[PDB]
C-alpha cells in the first residue's frame, strides 16, 4: 500500500548511502512482524558498503539471536564472499561490519563461521580475512570452544585449519571434551597419504605450544606417532621439542 | 540429609549456568525478579548499603521468594563463576556478586532434595 512506497524510497537511499542519520523506518526493522518481506523491498544486494555496516549495527543490538543469525546468513555473509572474489581485498565498511557482528557471538558463529567452513568452497584468502577478526575481538570461553569442537569434527580443508589455529591462539582455558576432539582431528591424518600444508603443522604447533600441560601420556605418545608418519623438515622437530619438555596436569 | 546446605547450592548454581538460568548483579537481579520468571534470591551479608538489603527483602516479601544469606560477596564470586581461569585452573579475576537470583533449575535428585528439606525446615 503506502508502506511499500516508504521502503521503495529508502531502497534508493541505501543504494546511494555514505553517511549521516538514516531514516527512522530502517532503524525499526527487527521490531517488525513481517521483516523479511520489508527487507526484500529495500534490496540488500543493491546496497552500498557503508550502508551494510549500519545495517549490521542495527541487527546486532536489537536482540533475538535467531533473527540476527538469519540476517548474516542471507545478506551479510554472501556479500563478504562476493567482494573477496571480485576486489581480492575486502572493503573497509564491510570489514567493520564483521567486527560489529561479534556483539552477538552465538549468531556470529552459527551464521558466519560455521556455515562458511561447511560449504567447502571457502578459499584460503576468505579464511584469513575473516579469521583475523577473531584474533581482534575477544570471544566468550563457552562460545569459543563450541565453534572449535565443530571445526575439529568437520571435513578437512586448507581454509579450515586457519580458524582452528587462531582460536587456540587466543589461549583460553579449554573444556576437556574439546581437547579429545582436537587430538582425534589431527590423528585422522596419521594414515593419510595426502601432502599436508604448512598451515596444518602450525596449527599442531600452537596446540602443543600452549596446551602441553593438558595432555595425557596416551594421546601424548599418539602425537609422536603422528609426526613420525607425517614429517616436516622445519616444524616437526619443534613439536617434538615441545612434547619432550612438557609437564602434565 | 546426605549433602549439606552450603554444598548443594553449588549444584543448583552449576545447573543454572548450564541451563542459562542465572540473574546475577543488581539490575538483572531485580528486573527479572519482578517479571515472575525468577524463583530464588541469594544475598550477601557483607554490604555497604542497607537500603539495597531492604529493597531485596521487600522483593522477597512481595512475590513470596525465599531469601538465602551468604557471608561475603567475594566468596560468592567462586560460587557464581565471575573469575577468569588459567590452563591449570587458577583465578586471576576477582569479582564477587552481592545478589544471585535463580531463574531456572536443573532436574536434580540430591541438591534439589536437600535444598527442599532446608526450605521446609525454614518455613
Amino acid at each position: 500500500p503506502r508502506v511499500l512506497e516508504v521502503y521503495r524510497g529508502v531502497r534508493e537511499v541505501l543504494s546511494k548511502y555514505r553517511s549521516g542519520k538514516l531514516p527512522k523506518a530502517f532503524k525499526i526493522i527487527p521490531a517488525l512482524s513481517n521483516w523479511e518481506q520489508i527487507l526484500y523491498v529495500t534490496e540488500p544486494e543493491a546496497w552500498t558498503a557503508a550502508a551494510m555496516y549500519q545495517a549490521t549495527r542495527i541487527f546486532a543490538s536489537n536482540l533475538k539471536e535467531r533473527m540476527a543469525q538469519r540476517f548474516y546468513n542471507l545478506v551479510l555473509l554472501p556479500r563478504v564472499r562476493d567482494d573477496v572474489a571480485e576486489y581480492k581485498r575486502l572493503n573497509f565498511h564491510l570489514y567493520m561490519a564483521l567486527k560489529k557482528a561479534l556483539f552477538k557471538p552465538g549468531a556470529w558463529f552459527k551464521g558466519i563461521l560455521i556455515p562458511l567452513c561447511e560449504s567447502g568452497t571457502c578459499t584460503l584468502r576468505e579464511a584469513i580475512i575473516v579469521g583475523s577478526i577473531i584474533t581482534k575481538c575477544s570471544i566468550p570461553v563457552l562460545h569459543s570452544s563450541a565453534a572449535m569442537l565443530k571445526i575439529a569434527e568437520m571435513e578437512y580443508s586448507g581454509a579450515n585449519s586457519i580458524f582452528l589455529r587462531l582460536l587456540l591462539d587466543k589461549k583460553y582455558a579449554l573444556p576437556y571434551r574439546v581437547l579429545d576432539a582436537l587430538v582425534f582431528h589431527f590423528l585422522g591424518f596419521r594414515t593419510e597419504k595426502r601432502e599436508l600444508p604448512v598451515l596444518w603443522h602450525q596449527c599442531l604447533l600452537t596446540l602443543v605450544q600452549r596446551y602441553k600441560a593438558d595432555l595425557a601420556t596416551d594421546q601424548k605418545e599418539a602425537l609422536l606417532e603422528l609426526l613420525r608418519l607425517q614429517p616436516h623438515p622445519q616444524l616437526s622437530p619443534e613439536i617434538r621439542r615441545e612434547l619432550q619438555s612438557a609437564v602434565p596436569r | 540429609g546426605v549433602m549439606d546446605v552450603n554444598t548443594a547450592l553449588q549444584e543448583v548454581l552449576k545447573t543454572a549456568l548450564i541451563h542459562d538460568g542465572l540473574a546475577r548483579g543488581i539490575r538483572e537481579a531485580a528486573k527479572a525478579l519482578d517479571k515472575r520468571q525468577a524463583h530464588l534470591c541469594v544475598l550477601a551479608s557483607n554490604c555497604d548499603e542497607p537500603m539495597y538489603v531492604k529493597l531485596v527483602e521487600a522483593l522477597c516479601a512481595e512475590h513470596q521468594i525465599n531469601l538465602i544469606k551468604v557471608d561475603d560477596n567475594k566468596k560468592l564470586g567462586e560460587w557464581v563463576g565471575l573469575c577468569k581461569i588459567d590452563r591449570e585452573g587458577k583465578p586471576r579475576k576477582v569479582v564477587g556478586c552481592s545478589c544471585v537470583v535463580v531463574k531456572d533449575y536443573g532436574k536434580e535428585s540430591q541438591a534439589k532434595d536437600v535444598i527442599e528439606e532446608y526450605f521446609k525446615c525454614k518455613k
Binding site: 563457552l142 573444556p175 574439546v178 593438558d214 595425557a216 596416551d218 599418539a222 | 548450564i18 585452573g89
Partner: peptide, 18 residues
C-alpha cells in the same frame, strides 16, 4: 566422542554443546 581423554585432575566447567 573420542577414546583417549582427560584422565587426571579438576573439572571446573561441564560445557554446553547441545
Amino acid at each position: 566422542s573420542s577414546v583417549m581423554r582427560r584422565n587426571e585432575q579438576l573439572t571446573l566447567h561441564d560445557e554446553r554443546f547441545e
